[PDB]
Amino acid sequence: SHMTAPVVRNPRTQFPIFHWCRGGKALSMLPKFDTYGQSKVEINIVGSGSVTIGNAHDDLIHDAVLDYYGRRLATCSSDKTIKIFEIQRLVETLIGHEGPVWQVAWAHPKFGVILASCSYDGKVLIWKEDNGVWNKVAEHSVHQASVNSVSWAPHEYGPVLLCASSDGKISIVEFKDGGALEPIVIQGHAIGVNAASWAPISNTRRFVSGGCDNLVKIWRYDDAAKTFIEEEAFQGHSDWVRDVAWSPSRLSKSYIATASQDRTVLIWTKDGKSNKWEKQPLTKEKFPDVCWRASWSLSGNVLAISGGDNKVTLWKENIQGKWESAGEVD
Ligand SMILES: [Ca+2]
Ligand SMILES: [Ca+2]
Ligand SMILES: [Cl-]
Ligand SMILES: [Cl-]
């Protein structure tokens, strides 16, 4: 051929995982290599007793999350599967996805022992444990692209899943009658959506999303419109927003953290008695590599960030409203 336009070649990676206590147990996963240059990816589960699950999958692990009673661990992988451990023994491998599984999320226990998974294959699958055995119970297949995140609503809203896709859309669907049958699907972000997370209960129902237009958006359920409408669109990031986290403190003042492949985290806040949002960078300097995941403690408003620095870094706001390092998880 005769090609005058520039042609480039481009390429996939393992990041750390951490979550705050469930059933008394915190979880961490810090990638390492040994002396033979072999990956050693150990999931540590630490209570007030520690258990280590080594090599849960042979391929990349994209998520690892305990259930709310800290009795089960779900891990998911580029190998297209989800593994369920009782915590240790491997109990089941959940087979159904046709591409990498990016995230899993546990439903509130009032609904049962239920896991949602999202995948490159464009599906959200819902799995349920009954009498110690796992079965696929529903499929939510409205996206025409990778589905990058899944999150269950506050249980007061019902068993409702929030899903973000590379097709630019966000879907919100209630699981009922062994199906996912009446979804709301909205155009969320240009190019793609990477994450969406629920606000804590207020009765206005909100969530926040981040995507490939470098924007963070806040959405509210409108009673008159009977759908979710865009309430805020926050500028600040200079590259794709990779994760968004709405702090579960629900006392007056709201906190949202947004993590970006621009190598920064922005903290957005709104005073209880204000309608105005304000932003502050988490850190004075860029992180060494992308910021991939963010999550807040249940109390104390401590922020955990995972990224290509290969660390889980912790952050705490000081008396003067500035963020300081609180160490890192080992
Ligand atoms: Ca797209
Ligand atoms: Ca999250
Ligand atoms: Cl979860
Ligand atoms: Cl969070």
Layout of secondary structure:
Layout (H helix, E strand, L loop, with lengths): L16 E6 L2 E5 L2 E2 L5 E2 L1 E5 L3 E5 L6 E6 L5 E6 L3 E6 L2 E7 L5 E6 L6 E7 L4 E7 L2 E8 L6 E6 L7 E6 L3 E6 L9 E4 L5 E6 L7 E6 L4 E7 L4 E8 L6 E6 L7 E7 L4 E6 L6 E5 L9 E6 L6 E5 L4 E6 L5 E6 L2
Antiparallel strand pairs: 1-2, 2-5, 3-4, 5-6, 7-8, 8-9, 9-10, 11-12, 12-13, 13-14, 15-16, 16-17, 17-18, 19-20, 20-21, 21-22, 23-24, 24-25, 25-26, 27-28, 28-29, 29-30
Task: Describe the protein in words.
The protein is 0% helix and 53% strand. It is mainly beta. It has a single domain, classed as YVTN repeat-like/Quinoprotein amine dehydrogenase (Methylamine Dehydrogenase, Chain H, 7 Propeller), CATH 2.130.10. The radius of gyration is 19 Å and the shape is globular. The chain binds calcium ion (2 copies) and chloride ion (CL) (2 copies). One calcium ion (CA) binds at residues 197, 245, 295.
